[PDB]
């Protein structure tokens, strides 16, 4: 029986009309979506468009050339035996390459969300009236209005408004590009010499090859989740609750798909089946989409007018069969069709398809069947909402559905599930290539340092767009944090000048920690925390939930920051949900706060509580 | 767990397995047919201000033509049906009815004997049971329409599994508040006033949040084959004439409120079918007592 | 040493006793002759376009005319066939039909009463024990086909014994691969695919090669006197219609898939050849049901 | 655990939605009354010497007179009995008979066009649903007779749940060895060899202990309303040849090896009672289908 | 490799060479349509109360007027239809039966001995060489309903061979759990739960997984012209009575269950065409036979 939800739907009106097929030249057959995986032209541009964007940011020359630099600085954290970080070896690197570029996109987009809560928080009462007031308008009017009331840098939430706002380093990242040029395939036979191993450690195996030619990650924007944040929000803290509760649920699904390149194991590829010589008004299709960031997978079939539907987990599979358990039943699809296959890859999370398979279903004989194909597609291959404006809004209405506390998914369950599935994966890789091969053999690749996006330490890059009477500020939001244990935070400033005089700025709640380090090349320890099983630190006496670093460097070139955690495979903290964001109110408004390191004297640095300044002049204390 | 049943439905006592052939359905329509002409003969008297109408039909009903300073109480059919009515109720009833009355009776006025030509529908709600954990209470009141108050006492949100058998057709749940229902091993759906529901499709789940109590009002409506003579307003104001008179009082037997539920407590219970088709010619049986003693009254 | 039989052997129930004079055997035959009556009288209606040929047909069989907003149940001759049909597969079924009701039924119409005019052959395979040594497993499934699986565990060849009764006529043995069987005392012959065997020459010796399991299928065929009016189509269909009924639902007897096991376990059960009497009665009964009952649902 | 179902009851395809109009169904009705009397015309023709009875039947069929060197075909009424046919067993065959064809071919007889007179009964056991432990191997095979083999590697005795849905109305299950069967929260009665059930009760518990492995052959009745003039064996006959015959390749249909098997799968469908209707329209068809390509063969 | 074949299409033996000519094949048809009358004469005599419909048919089968004391056997017409079966079945049965007499028999009625006005679908599954790895293990069990068990126990997926001949028209599988099968030298689908295969395609691969073992159910259906009487129900009741009866007792034949597996396992010998021929005269003998011996029991 098919799951149905009661939930409350607008009317839609099909721009093919009664007939339900588009009259010939009009204004409405030029507006029709079209299929974008079926149609070889536009499955090729797009994938050409998504290389390029990746190689403008991300260049492999560039990326090969920083590899002896990043490997002094891993070497530089004095790592305890078991946990160091070696970039010598190929499948370290690569694997590296991609936990960096992922961080990255996660960082800036975590970013991005603690700054639209401060101008929600800031314009509170305007946000209030705007909320209960205009309750009958669109999710995405709302979006509108919010987005102007407050200052928010982008206010756009049309498509190619995200897409112009967007910057680089928010890129998804293209796998094929990166796995370009290794090699593959290194035999050395029964030799156990040095010379021998060196070789060993240049190459990676086959299965990371096809691991990486089958991985495009996918980052949120803000604009995309304050849609349905706003579409029940009647207050402006459950609307910023219902914020950080979605991309809490976002942030667990990236970790996830960097784990599934850790384990030996290959991913699997989301596909099409088509048929192979198609008839008109017997058309069908099958869409199965394996998200890598997620732990749950949807398989739709569009026979007729039908649309049928099937939720299963990516975990358990016994490998005779590449889904696991149903979760939730939306009828029967039959996934033994016989037709041509396309593989495409996914640009929205697998909450957000089902959120759009939902409302898609819903609105099946209101639709014609080119109009379901078209926006399905659309909205799987290029993250393009639809046009139909009624569609949209219930397309948005049960993505809140599914990430509220009353989700017909337990999603804590299943990805609680994931992790102990890619756990016991490894385990088994490990020890299977631990015999065939041996030991130092297993290490090289397959590495024990690498478990997860959040675990593993990483590097990120900053990029600085802001001089202060000549100081450059670089800005890194330390947290929030999925795992609880100690952790250790590194920064590295390169300087054309031979001596140079760089500050390091940690903001709290009430006050900030002001430091000065004067050493370039070298990685120099920042600051030291301990996080409880609840995800928050105790910074100078009051729980912090996350913090914000802020460095200044004078004529800097690049400035990294590392992240390390003393244990590896640091033990995860359950993922908050709504109840738990409104519990607990951090805040976040003195992160936006500057000072001037030209005009420092020695009192001001240390820790200093705002009552010592004056309004303004963070600098330079009372 | 705790458990709460209907109060109709439980412990329904046999009935009776006599005058259930074809002779004694016949005479059943017989002296409904003939009760029916006494009623309205009475009628026509009393518009032609003379007793020639109703004497007429007397003399059929009773094989006796009235006479002064006798009281007139139907003759040897009243005591025929009176006496059959008592036990198809219980089967403790004693069969004193011979055959000889009863097939004299039968030829009286030609009609079929046929109890399945046509259709009734029943409002009784069965609810055989309803499972609710430790810390919830569940009450449930009235026959025709059922409310069952719920009230969760513990820290979390409890399921209660509401079982409406498998007779009914449909049943139609209506809340105080918008409340969550779906069948077993189903995600629940959003909140909704009233849900419709199939009695097959199985065991009911209901999320009970914390907080102020959540009735439930339900309705059914259930199919029973009956004889086209049937007429549901005579049938029950025969039940309640049978009942003030006395005819139901036997031992170790149950009593029900109205036609309605006895029907539908029979219907449940083991070899129910069987059950189901005597409790129907006691309704047309019903139905001419109560046609029968409205014409002929007692102060 | 381990025994299996076939499961619709085991315990055959008591039949009725009742309804089995020369009075009574009429009355089956007769309701027969008129129930196929009602069947042929609806193509005579469409061909005539009238109703005629069913009044005269349903007057006959039921002694009232057929009349609109009256359910058409067949009268005093559907009650009386199925409370018969009630006594035949029980004897603990009160038989509740006067006498005086079947004389009055049976004069409808003239027909021959003879229950032994004619024969037919009924498939049902009886396997009533396989002997089999400590290290083999023998399982038998089905009924009118029964496929009996052995394996061999042991380290030698084993000798597994086949007893098929003494009423079938004939009984066809197939395997999955050539074996070898014999009589108790016979020399074995070379291995074959087939093999053809009277159940009364003799308990059957099989031997058992280590390895692979053997699997053998067996076919029976058992001649049984019948009215010559007897169908085993419509008494197939009959059989099922009585079950769905509840005309067989009555405490202590045994329930079979088909009328074919029903006559062959009674036939196989102590005092064999007059409980199988009793079955024709009551198979000529159950074709009389299918036919009015198909032509008058109820 | 485990979960093991019925090959036949698995994707059943939706059917057409053209000629089931009352008119429609009485050309069917028709097509089965005079294709019928084609088969009984040439009995008629060995009694007598005439050809008068098949020449009678044939033109009434055909619309035209016989020929000695012209293949005779059935003319218009064959080729829209066979487009029909068509129609009926997949949604996306095309309807291609004009109404006005069909509304003259249902005048050449009188004949009711009803399609809920009588009832037969369908042979397909429909077990939905095997619910095993972890250590226990569940297996299905057949669709008329199904023999479920069930087989214990646990330490301990294993429940085993069978579900056989909410449409057949009696089921019988007899096992090689006597097992325990019982309801959901019920009281675990002694071993005995068969077991009458009623599907409608629910889900039933089987005690599958530690040895020998235990397998239950399962047979089903259900009743579904049919003509008057319905015939299992002819429709059996016909649904065979429609397939040798290309009447049912479409893409995206399942296959069936018997009209019984496809009837009781599109039962077991949600909103299986409007696709029965549809169904016992297509046997009719198949019924006539059969007579005629008999009497007149390609 | 190991190779597994049906056990009733081994070694068919060689069918008689008499009795083909048009003289004798009008004689068998003769027969059966006054075998037929006889047995309808019983439902005529009930109704006109008097043996006067039956003396009447006698008289024409048997040329005699029966007296009261005589056990009416059929007469020349009986002793002429038992020879000519046995010489049917094999080449070693002596042809007793002169010429003159089936002239003369032949003349009895007016009714055609032609053969081929008609067409029959069989049921019987013709698989006849399943070819396997190493180690693999295959059963082939049943004829109307092909039960294929394979398990495997290498490491790694084997492929199994089915050859399902030439002759068959239509083939349906269904297993246990859903499988892999394709043609030779084609890609292999997703697992599906039944397929549907036309044999002259050529020899079809089971991918065969490692673990529980496969069930594969297969039914086939073909075509073989028939006289348009065919009877399928009425062959089959006559082919075990012959068996009964001892009509087929000859040295160096083979044994079958139906007359299903008969005439399937000489369509697959080498001269299948010549063979099938007097397969289906056989046909119609064995069904005058089942008519004339249920009216006529000796």
Known sequence: ?622 | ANRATSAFLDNPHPVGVNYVDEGSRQFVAVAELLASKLIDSSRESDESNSDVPFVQAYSKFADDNPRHLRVKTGGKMANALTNVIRSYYSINAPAIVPQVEIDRLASKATVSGDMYNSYAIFNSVPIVEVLSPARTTVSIVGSDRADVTMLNTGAGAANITFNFGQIAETVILKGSVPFQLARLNQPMPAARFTYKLRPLDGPFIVVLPVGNPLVISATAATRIQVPLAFNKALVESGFQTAMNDGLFDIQNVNYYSSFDEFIISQYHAQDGINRVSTCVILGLALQAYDQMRRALPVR
Not at chain 1, 82 to 108: C, P, V
Not at chain 1, 114 to 124: A, G, M, V, Y
Not at chain 1, 423 to 446: L, P
Not at chain 1, 490 to 495: F, H, I, P, R
Request: hydrophobic share 40%.
């Open chain 1, 1 to 622: 029986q098919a799951y149905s939800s009661g939930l409350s739907q607008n009317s839609i009106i099909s721009l093919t009309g009664n007939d339900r097929t588009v009259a010939d030249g009009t204004f409405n057959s030029m507006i029709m979506p079209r299929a974008v995986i079926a149609n070889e032209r536009e499955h090729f541009m797009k994938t050409r468009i998504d290389k390029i964007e990746h190689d403008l940011n991300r260049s492999a020359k560039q990326e090969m050339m920083d590899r002896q630099s990043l490997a002094e600085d891993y070497n530089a954290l004095n790592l305890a035996v078991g946990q160091e970080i070696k970039l010598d070896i190929a499948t370290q690197h690569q694997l590296n390459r991609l936990g960096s570029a992922m961080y990255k996109a996660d960082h800036e987009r975590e970013t991005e969300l603690t700054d639209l809560i401060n101008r929600i928080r800031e314009n509170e009462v305007t946000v209030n009236g705007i909320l209960e007031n205009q309750k009958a308008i669109t999710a995405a009017e709302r979006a509108d209005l919010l987005l102007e009331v407050v200052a928010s840098t982008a206010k756009s939430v049309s498509a190619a408004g995200r897409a112009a706002a967007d910057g680089s380093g928010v890129v998804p990242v293209f796998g094929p590009s990166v796995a370009n040029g290794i090699k593959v395939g290194i035999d050395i036979a029964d030799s156990v010499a040095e010379a021998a191993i060196a070789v060993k450690e240049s190459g990676i195996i086959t299965q990371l090859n096809d691991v990486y030619h089958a991985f495009q990650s996918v980052h949120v924007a803000p604009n995309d989740v304050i849609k349905p944040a706003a579409v029940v929000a009647g207050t402006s803290t459950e609307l910023i609750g219902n914020l950080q509760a979605i991309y809490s649920r976002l942030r667990s699904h990236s970790d996830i798909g960097f784990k599934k390149a850790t384990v030996g194991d290959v991913i699997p590829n989301s596909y099409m089946i088509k048929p192979v010589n198609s008839t008109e008004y017997a058309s069908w299709q099958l869409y199965v989409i394996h998200p890598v960031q997620g732990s749950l997978g949807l398989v739709v079939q569009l026979m007729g007018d039908a649309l049928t539907y099937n939720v299963f987990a990516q975990y358990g599979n016994t490998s005779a069969s590449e889904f696991g358990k149903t979760v939730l039943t939306g009828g029967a699809t039959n996934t033994a069709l016989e037709g041509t296959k396309v593989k495409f890859q996914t640009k929205v999370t697998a909450q957000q398809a089902l959120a759009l398979t939902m409302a898609l279903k819903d609105a099946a004989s209101m639709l014609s069947q080119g109009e379901l194909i078209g926006y399905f597609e659309q909205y799987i291959n290029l993250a393009l909402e639809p046009d139909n404006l009624s569609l949209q809004d219930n397309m948005h209405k049960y993505h809140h559905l599914l990430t509220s506390q009353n989700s017909p998914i337990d999603w804590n369950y299943h990805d609680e599930e994931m992790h102990k599935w890619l756990d016991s994966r490894k385990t088994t890789n490990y020890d299977a290539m631990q015999k065939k091969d041996g030991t130092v053999i297993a290490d090289i690749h397959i590495p024990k340092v690498f478990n997860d996006l959040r675990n593993t330490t990483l590097h990120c890059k900053l990029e600085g767009k802001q001089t202060i009477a000549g100081y450059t500020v670089y800005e890194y939001l330390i947290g929030p944090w999925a795992h609880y244990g100690d952790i250790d935070y590194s920064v590295v400033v390169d300087t054309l000048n031979e001596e140079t005089k760089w500050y390091c700025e940690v903001i709290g709640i009430d006050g900030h920690l002001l430091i000065e380090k004067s050493v370039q090349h070298k990685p120099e320890k920042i600051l030291e925390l301990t996080v409880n099983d609840s995800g928050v630190t105790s910074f100078n006496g009051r729980n912090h939930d996350r913090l914000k670093l802020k460095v200044y460097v004078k004529d800097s070139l690049s400035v990294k920051v590392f992240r390390n955690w003393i244990g590896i495979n640091a033990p995860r903290v359950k993922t908050k949900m709504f109840n738990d964001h409104i519990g607990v109110k951090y805040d976040y408004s003195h992160f936006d706060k500057n000072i001037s390191p030209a005009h420092l004297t020695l009192t001001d640095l240390g820790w200093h509580t705002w009552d010592q300044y004056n309004a303004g002049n963070w600098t330079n204390i009372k």
